[PDB]
Structure 1
């Protein structure tokens, strides 16, 4: 039983692009006709603050450097001056059937994989993963920098069966912690909904709407696009922002990054906090790669040792492996 040379898992928990529209707090229940936050341009002349090669006893290059500073053009997105509330709306499907790959060479390896995943689900449900997913929808991880420094953040979650609303939840994101996964009755209800979705026992479509008090005319933070150097300064050399038809927006994979911050099971340090689930579990901003393959906690090592050789790891590492199967990806050689 060698590994399959081709493996591919389609993703579950598929989000959409979040739209941002600004308005006034306590006009909050009628947040349906609020105008969108537009992305505009402004000019910025920046000085030079680069880390120069030190002991430079030539001030003539420094005073020569001030003769032509950076003439630059950026994009900003601000609230209107008579509005102090950011509204961020997106949707979320929960597909289910999180064991079946979409492409596999071997037939014995695929049947062994389905017996392993079905053994996992029959031993214990999806209650843990849906509890942590419910905590990431409870607070406002998907408000990345917009959450930082806010008076009150309110999250409203709706469940949709038809052109109707089945059950509505209304949370408070600042009371719910950022690092402490504590239980609650409503989070157990919504965790039963998501856990009922991932098991394939129904269709789950959720509508997530987030509200934040920032301030009158302050700055919101959409996601930033990639700029090739075929454009000049007047032509956005600096800083473009992602948009839809005349509205600022966030990419879908960034919200999808914010939902799957589960992993509190690093070998190195459990004191920092949960950072998202990746094979070779890594953080791009910190420049570090936790969960090294020189250890025995990598996804490929645990999956090979648990499918081929029946060496079942600890329970929390099994939550890690099934979390990588809900993530999906391109596996195999």
Structure 2
């Protein structure tokens, strides 16, 4: 058998665009009429601060470059001056049926894939991957820079079965670290819920609301937009923040990248912490790709060794390739 020419996995764990609002601490139970954090503009004047070339040391030329003022317009987002708590809310739906691709050219390859993932669920459940997903929901890893230096972060998760809430979870997101993976009875019950949603045994819907206690009037950090440059034109606004209906927001893919930061089995190290799961597992902040294909630990060769060659890898690498199956992708030649 060979790999299929087309292979396409729909993503599970679909998040919403996380919307921001603001209020005071100890009002967070009544945090439904909290007004949205809006995006404003302001003006910045800076100086010459980057590295200069060795041909451009030239102190008269540097003084000439200083005396031309450097001005930009910058999108900014702040809390109100009487509110010290940022409330970030998104919804997350778990679907199940993680093994079936959305497209496969080879029928025998997709049947071998289906029996492979069926045997994987038969050997053990999703409980390791589901426990790590519940960890990334437990600590507020989706608060990307809003969590850095926060006083107290607190996460509420509401499983909504019918039109009302079915269950609630209450977590202190600063007690649960970002490095190691603990075990807690509420966290394991939430892990059982996300595992049962991933197994096709139901359709799980969660509403996640995080309260960070930052400070009065402080700056929050929503997503930034992509503006490709109008090069032979006027100067542009050199920052643009994401907003949904005049409310500061984080992208859905940003929360999704924050959720799947579970990979602690990459061969380079283990003390730097978990990274996000992807084939040739590469983090954009470091600019360097762990799980290189010259070692046999990337997703593609592991999948080909498990399915085509029937070499089942180690159980943490089975967790890794199953997490890549939940993450999805367009795989092929």
Q: What's the TM-score once normalised by structure 2's chain length?
A: 0.97
Deviation at 1:231, TM superposition (A): 8.9
- Structure 1, residues 257-285: CA drift from partner, whole Å, max 9, x if none? 00001110011111110010010010111
Deviation at 1:66, TM superposition (A): 1.6
SS in 2 for 1:331: strand
Q: 1:279 matched to which residue of 2? A: 279
Q: Contact between 1:73 and 1:234, CA under 8 Å: does it hold in 2?
A: no
Over 3 Å counting, the alpha-carbon distance change for 1:234 and 1:248 in structure 2 is farther
Deviation at 1:162, TM superposition (A): 1.3
RMSD: 1.5
| Structure 2 spans left out of the alignment, 5+ residues | none
Deviation at 1:67, TM superposition (A): 2.0
Deviation at 1:50, TM superposition (A): 1.9
- Structure 1, residues 269-322: CA drift from partner, whole Å, max 9, x if none? 111100100100101110111110000001000000110111111111000010
- In 2, distance between residues paired with 1:122 and 1:79? 49
Over 3 Å counting, the alpha-carbon distance change for 1:55 and 1:236 in structure 2 is closer
Segment of structure 1 superposing worse, 46-55 or 191-200: 46-55
Q: Contact between 1:222 and 1:241, CA under 8 Å: does it hold in 2?
A: yes
SS in 2 for 1:142: coil
Q: Contact between 1:231 and 1:237, CA under 8 Å: does it hold in 2?
A: no
SS in 2 for 1:247: coil
Q: 1:291 matched to which residue of 2? A: 291
- In 1, distance between residues paired with 2:131 and 2:56? 57
Deviation at 1:62, TM superposition (A): 1.1
Over 3 Å counting, the alpha-carbon distance change for 1:48 and 1:111 in structure 2 is same
Q: Contact between 1:74 and 1:236, CA under 8 Å: does it hold in 2?
A: no
| Structure 1 spans left out of the alignment, 5+ residues | none
Q: Contact between 1:45 and 1:71, CA under 8 Å: does it hold in 2?
A: yes
Q: 1:252 matched to which residue of 2? A: 252
- Structure 1, residues 166-199: CA drift from partner, whole Å, max 9, x if none? 1111110011111110101001100000000000
Segment of structure 1 superposing worse, 232-241 or 21-30: 232-241
- In 2, distance between residues paired with 1:191 and 1:304? 29
Q: What's the TM-score once normalised by structure 1's chain length?
A: 0.97
- In 1, distance between residues paired with 2:144 and 2:275? 13
- In 2, distance between residues paired with 1:264 and 1:234? 46
SS in 1 for 2:218: coil
SS in 2 for 1:42: strand
Deviation at 1:58, TM superposition (A): 2.4
